[PDB]
Every structure is written in structure tokens, then in C-alpha cells.
Amino acid sequence: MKQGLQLRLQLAMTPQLQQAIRLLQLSTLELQQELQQALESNPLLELPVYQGETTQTLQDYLMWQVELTPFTDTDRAIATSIVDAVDDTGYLTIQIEDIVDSIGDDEIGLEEVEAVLKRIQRFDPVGVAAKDLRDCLLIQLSQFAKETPWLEEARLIISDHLDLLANHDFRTLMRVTRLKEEVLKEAVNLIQSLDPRPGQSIQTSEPEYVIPDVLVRKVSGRWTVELNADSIPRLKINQQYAAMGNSARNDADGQFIRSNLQEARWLIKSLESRNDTLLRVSRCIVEQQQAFFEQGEEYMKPMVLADIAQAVEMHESTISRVTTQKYLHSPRGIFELKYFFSSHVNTEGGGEASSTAIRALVKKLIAAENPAKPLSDSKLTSMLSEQGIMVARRTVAKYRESLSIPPSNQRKQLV
Amino acid sequence: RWLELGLTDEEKQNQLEQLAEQYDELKHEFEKKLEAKRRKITQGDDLAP
Amino acid sequence: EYKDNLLGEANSFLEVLEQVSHLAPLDKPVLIIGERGTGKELIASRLHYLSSRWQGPFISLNCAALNENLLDSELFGHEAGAFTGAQKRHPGRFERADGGTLFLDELATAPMMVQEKLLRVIEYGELERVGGSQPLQVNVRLVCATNADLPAMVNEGTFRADLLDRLAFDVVQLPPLRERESDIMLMAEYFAIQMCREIKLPLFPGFTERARETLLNYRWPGNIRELKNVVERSVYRHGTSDYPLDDIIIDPFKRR
Amino acid sequence: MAEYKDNLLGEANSFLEVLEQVSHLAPLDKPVLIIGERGTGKELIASRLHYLSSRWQGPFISLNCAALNENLLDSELFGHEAGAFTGAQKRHPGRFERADGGTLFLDELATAPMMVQEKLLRVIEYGELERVGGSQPLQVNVRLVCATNADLPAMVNEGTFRADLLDRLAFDVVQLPPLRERESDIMLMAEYFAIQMCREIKLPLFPGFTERARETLLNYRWPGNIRELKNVVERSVYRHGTSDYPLDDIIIDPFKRRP
Ligand SMILES: Nc1ncnc2c1ncn2[C@@H]1O[C@H](COP(=O)(O)OP(=O)(O)O)[C@@H](O)[C@H]1O
Ligand SMILES: Nc1ncnc2c1ncn2[C@@H]1O[C@H](COP(=O)(O)OP(=O)(O)O)[C@@H](O)[C@H]1O
Ligand SMILES: [Mg+2]
Numbered sequence: 001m002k003q004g005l006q007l008r009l010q011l012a013m014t015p016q017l018q019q020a021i022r023l024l025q026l027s028t029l030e031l032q033q034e035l036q037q038a039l040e041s042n043p044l045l046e047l048p049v050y051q052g053e054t055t056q057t058l059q060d061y062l063m064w065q066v067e068l069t070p071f072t073d074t075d076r077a078i079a080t081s082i083v084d085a086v087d088d089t090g091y092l093t094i095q096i097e098d099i100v101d102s103i104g105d106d107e108i109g110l111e112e113v114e115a116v117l118k119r120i121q122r123f124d125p126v127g128v129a130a131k132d133l134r135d136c137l138l139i140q141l142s143q144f145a146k147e148t149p150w151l152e153e154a155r156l157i158i159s160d161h162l163d164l165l166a167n168h169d170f171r172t173l174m175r176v177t178r179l180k181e182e183v184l185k186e187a188v189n190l191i192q193s194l195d196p197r198p199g200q201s202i203q204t205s206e207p208e209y210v211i212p213d214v215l216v217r218k219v220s221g222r223w224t225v226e227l228n229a230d231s232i233p234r235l236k237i238n239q240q241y242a243a244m245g246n247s248a249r250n251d252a253d254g255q256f257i258r259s260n261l262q263e264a265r266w267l268i269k270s271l272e273s274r275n276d277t278l279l280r281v282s283r284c285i286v287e288q289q290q291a292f293f294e295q296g297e298e299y300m301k302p303m304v305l306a307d308i309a310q311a312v313e314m315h316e317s318t319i320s321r322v323t324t325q326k327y328l329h330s331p332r333g334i335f336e337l338k339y340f341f342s343s344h345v346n347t348e349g350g351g352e353a354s355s356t357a358i359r360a361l362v363k364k365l366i367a368a369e370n371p372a373k374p375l376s377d378s379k380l381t382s383m384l385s386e387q388g389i390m391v392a393r394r395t396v397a398k399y400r401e402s403l404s405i406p407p408s409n410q411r412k413q414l415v
Numbered sequence: 416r417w418l419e420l421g422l423t424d425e426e427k428q429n430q431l432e433q434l435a436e437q438y439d440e441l442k443h444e445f446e447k448k449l450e451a452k453r454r455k456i457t458q459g460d461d462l463a464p
Numbered sequence: 465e466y467k468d469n470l471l472g473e474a475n476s477f478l479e480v481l482e483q484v485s486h487l488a489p490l491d492k493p494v495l496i497i498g499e500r501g502t503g504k505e506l507i508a509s510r511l512h513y514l515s516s517r518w519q520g521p522f523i524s525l526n527c528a529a530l531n532e533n534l535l536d537s538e539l540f541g542h543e544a545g546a547f548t549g550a551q552k553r554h555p556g557r558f559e560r561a562d563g564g565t566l567f568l569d570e571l572a573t574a575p576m577m578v579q580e581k582l583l584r585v586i587e588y589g590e591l592e593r594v595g596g597s598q599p600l601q602v603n604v605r606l607v608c609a610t611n612a613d614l615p616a617m618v619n620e621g622t623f624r625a626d627l628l629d630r631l632a633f634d635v636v637q638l639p640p641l642r643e644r645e646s647d648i649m650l651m652a653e654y655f656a657i658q659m660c661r662e663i664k665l666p667l668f669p670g671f672t673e674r675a676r677e678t679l680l681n682y683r684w685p686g687n688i689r690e691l692k693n694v695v696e697r698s699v700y701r702h703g704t705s706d707y708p709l710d711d712i713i714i715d716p717f718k719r720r
Numbered sequence: 721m722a723e724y725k726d727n728l729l730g731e732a733n734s735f736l737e738v739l740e741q742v743s744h745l746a747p748l749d750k751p752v753l754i755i756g757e758r759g760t761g762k763e764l765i766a767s768r769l770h771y772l773s774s775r776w777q778g779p780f781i782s783l784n785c786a787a788l789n790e791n792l793l794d795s796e797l798f799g800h801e802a803g804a805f806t807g808a809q810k811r812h813p814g815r816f817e818r819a820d821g822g823t824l825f826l827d828e829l830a831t832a833p834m835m836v837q838e839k840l841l842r843v844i845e846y847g848e849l850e851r852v853g854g855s856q857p858l859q860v861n862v863r864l865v866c867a868t869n870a871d872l873p874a875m876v877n878e879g880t881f882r883a884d885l886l887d888r889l890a891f892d893v894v895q896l897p898p899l900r901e902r903e904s905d906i907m908l909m910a911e912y913f914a915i916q917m918c919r920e921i922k923l924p925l926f927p928g929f930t931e932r933a934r935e936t937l938l939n940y941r942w943p944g945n946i947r948e949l950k951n952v953v954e955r956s957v958y959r960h961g962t963s964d965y966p967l968d969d970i971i972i973d974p975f976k977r978r979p
């Protein structure tokens with residue numbers, strides 16, 4: 001009747017489940033780190049060489065040549081110091097002045113440092129120790145014979161006209177360099193194949209790093225999702241200490257051991273239940289994925305924390321902590337749980353959902369517009385009109401930045 | 416066949432109906448095996464993760 | 465299209481309809497002088513499916529059953545957690561209004577205060593009952609309809625001059641129940657067929673011309689689906705439309 | 721300090737002079753109380769004063785009394801800062817509090833709470849207001865704006881208004897030239913509304929109207945002063961719906977049975 005609020009409807013909190021959620025929101029790698037750092041005191045809580053082959057790593061390959069090259073002790077020291085602060089791309093990390101300071105010799109000067117670098121500038125490969133790469137591509141072209149045409153045009157452009165090509169400003173470039181029409185592009189292309197980051201070329205090899213935590217294998221539609229068994233932590237109750245407590249003459253001390261053990265059993269069961277709740281949540285998510293992942297991120301409905309926590313009895317904070325730093329390997333592959341949710345929109349697909357791979361493939365088509373110039377946001381809007389889903393140019397710029405696409409008047413290139 | 420012109424129009428009509436039936440039946444069966452096979456074409460393999 | 469249902473062979477039904485059509489692009493208030501058990505709602509529909517914003521919201525919320533004085537304040541709004549015991553205004557009606565019109569049934573009972581609050585709406589329409597929230601307007605049109613005697617209200621002063629005026633922009637007299645007699649035979653058979661079909665009654669009993677005459681005799685002021693209601697009565701009187709139609713039920717209180 | 725004349729139309733009676741006096745008042749911020757026909761020059765006058773309120777004056781805090789239900793009308797009245805009244809949370813500032821400096825767009829609704837009346841009396845007390853549980857008074861400011869549509873002195877003799885309802889009210893009065901009285905821009909504002917009406921109708925050409933219509937227009941009472949006629953005008957526009965096609969009649973009283 002006469003509405004309002006009226007009295008109706010305390011105790012003591014503890015951070016127990018709170019610390020547990022701190023673990024769950026924390027990633028399982030460091031979460032297991034704590035799990036070990038936890039189970040340590042809880043006593044009831046459970047060839048050498050193979051192939052053994054060394055490698056060059058490039059800089060030592062440079063040193064191999066330096067050893068065969070004639071060099072003095074100060075020359076060897078300067079070259080070695082130059083080698084010490086070297087980047088993967090093969091450009092010089094520190095300037096010549098920093099190298100002169102590192103040599104710490106008044107006899108060592110910038111000119112001697114430059115001479116040492118130049119004698120070692122193009123030994124292997126061309127354009128090593130690029131030193132703010134620019135003269136590096138210059139030395140690379142200089143290595144090429146002048147018999148190659150348009151070498152002069154490319155050289156004049158690289159001399160002091162890097163900015164004109166930086167914005168892809170072909171008209172301003174032609175107006176400045178007086179470069180030939182439809183021919184200066186030839187010098188540009190000869191410059192384009194100039195082995196940039198040539199030192200980056202040596203580096204090629206890596207091992208694998210992604211942890212499948214849950215596995216949905218699309219088992220006969222509506223994937224049979226399953227976590228990783230070995231990755232799931234588990235303790236073993238000290239049954240010896242369980243039998244070392246009651247019979248303890250201090251039946252008090254031993255039964256208290258039993259009580260602490262029972263409490264830890266509760267803790268472990270709660271963690272397992274956290275895993276299982278995450279698992280049933282994963283069942284709902286996999287029901288979603290049998291269409292979304294199967295239709296890919298393009299046909300994916302944006303979901304919310306509210307939406308998922310509604311399907312469960314889990315609290316919104318409960319889920320919000322539960323999935324933090326979680327990733328599962330699927331038929332698609334290893335995919336992060338934090339990636340699962342997405343913001344919805346005002347598109348005229350009849351509904352609200354997220355751009356995602358739609359935005360990515362939109363960037364793809366905008367690039368796929370005539371390679372002369374990047375497609376503007378109006379192109380995206382028309383593409384969406386064809387898609388029948390509402391998208392806006394501010395929204396287009398947003399989704400493009402999400403796909404990290406180049407700007408419309410920055411990605412224009414000579415076809 | 417003139418769509419059962421009616422040469423006997425009795426069993427020839429009947430036989431013609433049956434034959435067109437089997438003909439479409441084979442057309443469908445062929446297309447069906449074709450579709451199953453074509454699905455198998457791009458059916459796709461299981462690589463490691 | 466209201467299925468074109470409720471056919472009124474009274475070319476005045478058509479004429480009303482034509483007025484409606486002229487009103488259809490039109491976006492201003494309208495009264496429908498309806499009848500007891502007449503069916504202003506269905507025609508208002510027929511309008512809404514034809515609305516200038518026919519794609520617009522079409523809600524039916526009348527304050528005739530406004531048992532709560534506060535059901536109003538709601539309909540005018542609520543601050544989020546206004547009073548308390550609640551989260552936010554349940555704003556559905558206020559929702560339909562923006563991107564819509566206003567339709568009500570039997571506007572007689574309104575608290576006069578409620579009414580003139582509606583007045584402060586129609587001319588301007590602030591975010592209302594909103595517990596101090598800043599104003600806000602619903603792109604809201606209107607339509608009115610009742611079986612009451614407007615002069616009776618005027619004598620009652622029931623509609624304020626600002627109210628009676630700015631409230632009203634068109635008047636749609638439902639023909640009297642007996643006014644649309646040829647229409648009566650028409651939509652009567654319309655129901656007859658509609659019933660014989662949907663009932664899946666294996667045969668259609670048809671109609672006894674004597675029953676037809678008796679039915680026409682029914683002043684039947686209520687006919688909204690009160691036509692359909694007496695129709696269901698008569699159908700049960702037949703019980704089954706297999707036989708030709710003669711069993712016509714009007715007054716069902718009678719035992720025996 | 722601008723025009724914002726808006727659709728303030730049809731003042732060829734001394735309603736022009738009415739506006740003039742309104743202007744004479746406009747600089748002063750003291751209590752405003754007026755009088756006149758509801759839905760008829762009235763809230764337009766309100767707009768008029770809202771323009772008279774400096775554009776930079778502030779929120780034209782509209783006060784619509786036919787609302788407020790019963791009780792916590794009190795809440796937003798005195799205020800509500802405590803718990804158990806308006807969802808608690810922050811001190812909910814009432815529409816009364818919503819106006820700080822704003823328009824006391826008092827509407828003469830003639831609702832029952834002279835309880836309210838006394839409250840507003842304290843609203844108009846010392847420039848101050850205090851909330852529900854409102855632990856302190858707070859000296860408040862707002863422009864004050866009332867009007868009328870009926871016999872306030874009679875209701876005083878009728879006792880119907882709190883005597884002080886009027887006693888605190890109405891530094892002076894401001895009435896309206898009735899439709900039975902104003903009667904001057906008849907054809908004028910008639911055409912103005914007609915222009916708007918055809919334009920919305922996008923009617924290709926101004927129908928024109930016969931003089932029989934204007935003779936009726938003189939004959940008509942127009943009890944609703946401004947709109948009732950205006951509604952009538954738009955109604956003629958509709959019932960005709962023809963371009964350049966000169967009118968010879970108008971649409972007002974659809975309660976008139978059809979022939
Ligand atoms: N033209 C019509 N077509 C179909 N049904 C109608 C028509 N007119 C009235 N009715 C029926 O009358 C019943 C109540 O109708 P009505 O009296 O219009 O509503 P209200 O009580 O708001 O006037 C409705 O359920 C509707 O089925
Ligand atoms: N110049 C005008 N021409 C036509 N109609 C008008 C004119 N001025 C006011 N009206 C009409 O008068 C109606 C009531 O206005 P008003 O009396 O200010 O309402 P309130 O009761 O809030 O004071 C409005 O709906 C408006 O359409
Ligand atoms: Mg009804």
C-alpha cells in the first residue's frame with residue numbers, strides 16, 4: 001500500500017572460500033605453484049644429454065667470422081662489445097655513442113667505433129648491426145650491383161624520402177622526389193625486397209607452449225567436453241597419520257590431527273566441486289560452442305556473466321572468479337575462457353551481440369577492396385547492410401581498431 | 416517416352432509409371448551416394464592439438 | 465489487418481473505417497465512442513496493423529481496473545527503487561508509448577488527479593513518478609474509446625476542459641449494437657463459419673432463419689465477442705453442428 | 721536573453737498587453753501566480769515565463785500536481801535522505817530539491833492535500849527545505865511560478881483553498897483574455913495553426929476557407945480558449961484533407977450527431 005522499505009530479514013566472515021577464489025581467478029600455473037606452496041606444510045595433503053648439440057645463435061656466428069677476420073685486442077674488444085648488445089632483427093641495439101662509453105677508452109672514439117662497425121657491418125649478413133636501420137638497407141642495396149635498374153631512384157628515395165613512403169603518400173612523394181610516374185613505384189618495389197631485420201632471419205625455431213586444460217572433441221555433436229585429468233589437482237589423505245592419530249597416547253593430539261585432516265578434506269572437496277561447477281558451466285558453454293565454435297567466432301552470440309550465472313546456481317562473483325585465467329583446447333584448439341564473453345550491440349540482426357571474427361573478416365574484406373586503397377568505414381557500413389546487420393562508421397572504426405586494421409587513407413598502396 | 420503415350424495405356428501405363436519411379440529412385444540414390452562421398456571429400460582430418 | 469475480421473456490412477462500418485484510414489497516417493488523439501460489448505479493441509487493432517507506425521508498439525493497458533492508486537504511479541513511472549521493495553519502474557506501458565500511441569478502455573474511473581497528470585503528459589510528457597529523475601518523453605501518440613456518455617461526463621465534469629479537449633482529437637462512434645443490422649447478418653455468418661471451422665465440428669449447422677430472426681431481435685447491446693459469447697452458447701445449444709442449425713442459446717442462466 | 725517566441729500565437733486581444741505586463745514582471749524573480757484557461761494560453765504562458773526565466777536561469781522545474789499519489793509525495797516534497805523511503809541509497813533529492821534556483825512551476829490542480837498546501841507554505845517559507853529524516857534544514861532557492869483557472873477568492877470564501885494558500889500566494893494576479901473574450905487574432909492565429917496543419921499534412925496548397933466558417937468562428941464559444949479552437953482548426957484540415965480547396969465549414973464538435 002503505502003510503499004517504501006521496512007525492517008525484516010549477521011555473524012563473522014572468513015577468507016576461506018575467498019582465498020580459494022583467489023586461487024581460481026589466479027591461473028592454474030601459478031595456482032599450482034601456490035597449491036604446492038600450500039600442501040607442503042599440510043602433511044596429510046598430497047639421459048642427461050640426449051642429443052646435446054650446441055648452436056651458433058647468429059651473434060656467435062658473427063664471432064666465428066670475426067675470429068678469422070684480422071683484428072686487434074682493442075678492435076676485438078670493440079667488436080665483441082658491439083656484438084654483446086645485439087637485437088634479434090640484426091639491428092644495433094645501442095647507438096655508437098653508447099658503445100664508445102661501454103668501451104670506456106679515451107683512445108676509443110666514435111670514429112674508431114664506426115670503422116670497427118663498418119668493417120663488421122656487412123660480413124654476415126649484409127645489414128648487420130643496422131643501428132637505426134635505414135643505412136642498413138642502403139648497405140644491402142650497395143651490396144647489389146648497380147647493374148640493377150631503378151637502383152638510383154630507390155637510393156635517392158631511401159636517402160631522405162622515407163617519410164613520403166611512410167604515409168603511402170605517392171603524390172607527395174612524386175611532387176617532392178620528382179620521381180617518375182608508374183616508374184618510381186619500381187624503385188619502391190626494389191626497395192621493398194631489401195631483407196629487413198635480416199638478423200631476424202637467422203632466428204626461426206620454437207617449441208610448443210599452450211596447456212589444454214579442458215577437451216571438447218565435438219563428440220557426435222554437442223561436444224563431449226572433458227577437462228585435463230592430470231592437470232586437475234588432487235591430494236591424498238594421510239591414512240597413515242589418520243591411523244597415527246587416534247591411537248596416539250595424546251588421543252587429543254591425534255584426534256585433532258584427524259580434525260584438521262577432515263577440514264582439509266572439506267577444502268579439497270570444495271576445490272573439486274569448484275572444478276565440477278566450472279565443468280557443468282563448460283557443458284553449457286560447449287552446448288553454445290557446438291553452434292558458435294562450429295560456426296566459428298563469426299556466428300557467435302555475445303554472452304554475459306549474468307547470462308551464464310543464470311543457467312547455473314553459481315554466483316556471478318562465483319563464476320567471475322571461477323573462469324579467470326582459464327583456457328581449454330577444443331577441436332578448434334586451445335581457447336581462453338576469459339575470451340568466452342562479449343559485449344552486445346544495436347545491430348539490425350534482430351538482436352544484440354558481438355562483432356569478433358565478423359569484425360576480423362570485415363577487416364579482411366576492407367583490405368580485399370581494390371589494393372589501390374583501404375576500404376573506408378562507409379565500405380564497412382555497406383558490407384554490413386549487405387550483411388543485413390546494422391553497423392556504424394564510428395562503430396566501424398571501433399571494430400576495425402579491434403581487428404587492428406590500417407587506416408583508410410594510410411593503407412592506400414600502388415596496385 | 417511421350418509420358419506414357421498410352422500404347423497399351425494399361426500395364427504400359429503401369430509399367431511406365433513404375434519405370435519413371437525407379438528412374439527417379441536411381442537418380443536420388445546416385446545423388447545420395449554422391450553427397451555422402453563429397454562430404455567425405457572435404458570430411459577433414461584430426462591433427463594433434 | 466485485424467484479419468479484416470468483424471465484418472461490418474453497415475457501410476458506416478466502412479465509413480468509420482475510412483475515417484480510420486484517414487486517421488491512419490494521422491497522428492493525433494481520437495475517441496471511439498464504443499459500445500457495451502462492442503469491440504473497440506479489435507478495431508483499434510485494425511488501425512494499429514494499419515498504423516502510420518504500424519510497426520510501432522501496440523499495448524492494451526486500461527486503468528478501468530486500477531484497483532491500486534499506486535498502479536498509476538507505476539504507470540507514470542517509478543524511480544529505480546522508489547519507495548522501496550523494488551528494483552526499477554516496471555515501465556512496459558511507458559515503453560509502448562514511445563514508438564507508439566496510447567490506447568485505453570473505459571477512461572471513466574480515472575482519479576481526476578490521475579487524469580490531469582495524464583494531462584501534464586500529453587502536452588509535454590516528463591519522465592514521471594520517477595522519484596526525482598530528470599524528465600523524459602515517450603514518442604507517444606494516442607487513441608481513446610468508451611461506451612460512456614460523453615455529455616454525462618461533461619455534466620459530471622469528468623473530463624476537464626484541458627482534459628476533455630487536449631485529450632480528445634477524434635470521435636469514433638461505434639454504431640449502436642442494432643445500428644449495423646446488415647453488418648449484423650454479415651459478421652454473424654462470419655462467426656458462424658469461423659466457429660464451424662475452428663470447432664472442427666464435422667458439419668456446420670448453418671442457421672435457422674427463425675433463429676436468425678430471434679438473434680436479430682436480440683438488442684444484444686453487448687456484442688463484442690458477446691456476439692461470439694452468445695454464439696458459443698448457441699453452438700452448445702446445437703452442441704454439435706452436424707445437424708442443420710436451429711438450437712440458439714442466448715440466456716444461459718436458465719435451468720432446464 | 722533571446723526571442724524563443726515559439727508558438728506563442730494569437731494575442732491580438734490585450735493578451736498582447738497581457739504579455740507586456742508579463743514582461744514588466746519578467747525581470748523580477750519573486751513569486752509568480754497567474755490565472756486563465758487550462759490547456760489554453762496557460763501552459764503556453766508557462767513557456768512564456770520560462771523564456772522570461774533567463775535561458776541561463778535554470779531548469780524549468782515543471783510541477784504537475786495531479787500526480788503525487790498520496791504519501792511520499794511527501795518524500796520528494798520535504799525530501800528523502802534517510803533509509804526506508806525512496807530506496808535509500810543517496811539522499812534522494814526531491815523534485816522540490818531537484819529545483820535549486822529552478823522554476824516552482826506550481827500548477828493549480830485543486831487536489832485535496834491542503835496538507836501539501838501547508839507544506840508548500842513551508843516550501844515558501846524562508847528559502848529553505850529539509851528532507852525525510854532530513855537531518856538538517858537547508859536554505860534553498862528557486863523561482864516561483866503559479867497560475868490559475870478558477871475563482872480563488874471564492875474558494876477562499878468557500879474556504880476551499882487554505883487561506884494562506886492564497887495569502888502566501890500571488891504577489892499579484894495574471895488572468896487570460898477568454899476565448900469568449902480574446903476573440904481578436906481569430907482569423908490570424910486561425911491561419912497560423914492552419915499553416916502548421918497543412919504543412920504537417922503536407923497539403924499541397926492552402927485550401928482557403930469560406931467566410932461562413934469565420935462567421936461560425938465568431939459565433940463559436942470556444943470554451944477551451946487556445947487549443948479547442950486549434951484542435952478545431954486541425955480538425956477542419958483533416959475532415960477536408962484537400963489542397964487549395966477552399967473551406968466552407970470547420971470540425972470541432974464531433975459530439976454533434978452526424979446527418
Ligand atoms: N470486429 C471484431 N472482430 C472480432 N472480435 C470482436 C470485434 N469486435 C469485438 N470483438 C470481441 O469482443 C471481445 C471484447 O471486445 P470489446 O468489447 O471490443 O473489447 P472492449 O471490452 O475493450 O470493448 C473481444 O475479445 C473481441 O473478440
Ligand atoms: N497559438 C495556438 N494555436 C493553436 N493551438 C494552441 C495555441 N496555443 C496553445 N494551443 C493549444 O492549447 C493547448 C493547451 O495549452 P495550455 O493551456 O498551455 O495547457 P495547460 O493546461 O498546461 O496550461 C495545447 O495542447 C496547444 O495545442
Ligand atoms: Mg470493453
Ligand SMILES: [Mg+2]
Pocket residue numbers: 759762763827
Ligand atoms: Mg498546465
Ligand SMILES: [Mg+2]
Pocket residue numbers: 841884
Ligand atoms: Mg501560516
